Design a protein around this ligand. Sequence first.
Ligand SMILES: CCS(=O)(=O)N[C@H](Cc1c[nH]c2ccc(OCc3cccc(C(=O)O)c3)cc12)C(=O)N[C@@H](CCC(N)=O)C(=O)NCc1ccc(C(=N)N)cc1
Ligand SMILES: *[C@@H]1O[C@H](CO)[C@@H](O)[C@H](O)[C@H]1O
Ligand SMILES: *[C@@H]1O[C@@H](C)[C@@H](O)[C@@H](O)[C@@H]1O
Ligand SMILES: [Ca+2]
Ligand SMILES: [Ca+2]
Ligand SMILES: [Ca+2]
Ligand SMILES: [Ca+2]
Ligand SMILES: [Ca+2]
Ligand SMILES: [Ca+2]
Ligand SMILES: [Ca+2]
Ligand SMILES: [Ca+2]
Ligand SMILES: [Ca+2]
Lengths: 191, 142, 254
Amino acid sequence: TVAAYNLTWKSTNFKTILEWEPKPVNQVYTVQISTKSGDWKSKCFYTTDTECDLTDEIVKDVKQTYLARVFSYPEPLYENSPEFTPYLETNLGQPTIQSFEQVGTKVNVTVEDERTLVRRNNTFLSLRDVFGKDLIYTLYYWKSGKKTAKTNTNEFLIDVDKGENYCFSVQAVIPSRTVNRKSTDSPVECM
Amino acid sequence: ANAFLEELRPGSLERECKEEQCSFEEAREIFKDAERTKLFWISYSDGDQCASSPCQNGGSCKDQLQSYICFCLPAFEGRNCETHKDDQLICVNENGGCEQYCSDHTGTKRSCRCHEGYSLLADGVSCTPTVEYPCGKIPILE
Amino acid sequence: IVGGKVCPKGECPWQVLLLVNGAQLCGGTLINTIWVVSAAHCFDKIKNWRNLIAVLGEHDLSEHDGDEQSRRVAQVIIPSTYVPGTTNHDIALLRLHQPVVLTDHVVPLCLPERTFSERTLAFVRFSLVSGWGQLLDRGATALELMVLNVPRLMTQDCLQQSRKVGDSPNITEYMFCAGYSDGSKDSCKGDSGGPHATHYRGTWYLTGIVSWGQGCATVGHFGVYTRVSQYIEWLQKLMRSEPRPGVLLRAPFP
Ligand SMILES: CCS(=O)(=O)N[C@H](Cc1c[nH]c2ccc(OCc3cccc(C(=O)O)c3)cc12)C(=O)N[C@@H](CCC(N)=O)C(=O)NCc1ccc(C(=N)N)cc1
Ligand SMILES: *[C@@H]1O[C@H](CO)[C@@H](O)[C@H](O)[C@H]1O
Ligand SMILES: *[C@@H]1O[C@@H](C)[C@@H](O)[C@@H](O)[C@@H]1O
Ligand SMILES: [Ca+2]
Ligand SMILES: [Ca+2]
Ligand SMILES: [Ca+2]
Ligand SMILES: [Ca+2]
Ligand SMILES: [Ca+2]
Ligand SMILES: [Ca+2]
Ligand SMILES: [Ca+2]
Ligand SMILES: [Ca+2]
Ligand SMILES: [Ca+2]
């Protein structure tokens, strides 16, 4: 049997899946995850897949740093994963502009506050619920020159020219971050 | 889409890309600018990956660029919510929920056991002392 | 014990004190009223085999109270594979001449089933190690029973996280590391034979024995303990055996 390798974290809005290699040949896998001072908890028992969903485990405390390891079966052979801190590393999903109503010389662009995998009291918390002040949305607009706006909420109140039409696009952003600070651009919407 | 002579009319995002499927060229004729066209085209032409209905067991799919995300029901997990949290009552999974000893059983369910000096309670998972001073317990704290 | 704290009297009830000719020798763990588990190397230089004593209910080596109980060690069983001066198979099963009285201050630690220990206890992060050993490397020993909580490591990580020392003891499948590599906390020589107890769902089990290590609390090193789970069968078969004529007995292993 060979030890897993290239263990990688695939996380978006906290949906966290651990992937690895190689495509199992006469060997199955068992994953274990934990916090630095916590006990080891096993997942994806004797799976033949080369992936393991660890979402329900990490959303228990997104600000904890987790370590995982993939055991190989024909102490067993294993390989550790890179440390993973959800809050600081989960990718921000592509946003969606929920709407925009013009009012004379100004337009209100509303960003739909998408849901995450973080459960709480039998519900899914929004990206805003989780990051609060750490999250901002930036607007990239123009008259259908480049323009931009930023909000600490999920809405943009900008100036425009009636008679003239504008197109919009938004991005989720966590300023404090270093990597994965921005999400992909939202689809384009025009007045 | 293009029909006879419609191209004589000026570009329109609504009539061409919303009320119809528009090609890149048609999109480029409405946005003009290269960047604006591409920023619009990445999403417009990405295609909803939630079409296959990948999320199993009553889960909800959320579309993303060339991918999706499944939101599962409490009793489920997995990339596609294919994992039954109720089909994992094996010993390697948190000691099968047994307080002390766990014994797997092919087909049927696992059975719990206890160390000498203890007995298995009716819940089939807990153990209680059968002697005054069972091993592993600290008297002045009990 | 290095970097630990005093174990409140009564909270380390299975801890044993081994003396040879009245002098402190090693630590040990009671697992029933008649048997004690300690380390094999603790007997490398024993000459007066009829002078081994096991004390239970101990706490403060400077004050006597009625919780203390002494028993001659009637038998010291060591694996035939153990080699004096070395580290592999560092375990010893001792038969007390007479059973001790179980009390609030004298209670045995549970000897777990092999698979339960390998499959569950082994993955419980922290466990307790204790004894009256040194408080510092080459330092003096403790008057009051000390205890320390240490994290366990799979051998692969131990090896990877430790600095290599040419021509030094190998970490076998009969051992396991636990502790810290920053030079702050670890067990020590005088703690040998003492228990490495794991707490799991309300009960404490024996998972290790203080065995060896590079100095005590040395930077880049972890403490090493005998992996008790590899001896469960060995221990249970011997506890059902008939006492041998002399004190010392070497039993085959497996
Ligand atoms: C650095 C010397 S040391 O500090 O005494 N460490 C040695 C091992 C130790 C570490 N590096 C070494 C290099 C050569 C050597 O002896 C020769 C040698 C070479 C190759 C294989 C073996 C073998 O054991 O198989 C032995 C021993 C050691 C060591 O620990 N030796 C044993 C006794 C061996 C006996 N049967 O007499 C010992 O002192 N045990 C008590 C103890 C308890 C707890 C700790 C702790 N938690 N921290 C540390 C020590
Ligand atoms: C639905 O479409 C997505 C596209 O990525 C695919 O991954 C699923 O397997 C399919 O059911
Ligand atoms: C989408 O989310 C999942 C978890 C279920 O609650 C569905 O009913 C809902 O539409
Ligand atoms: Ca057209
Ligand atoms: Ca048309
Ligand atoms: Ca056109
Ligand atoms: Ca039409
Ligand atoms: Ca229309
Ligand atoms: Ca053209
Ligand atoms: Ca055209
Ligand atoms: Ca898509
Ligand atoms: Ca005393």
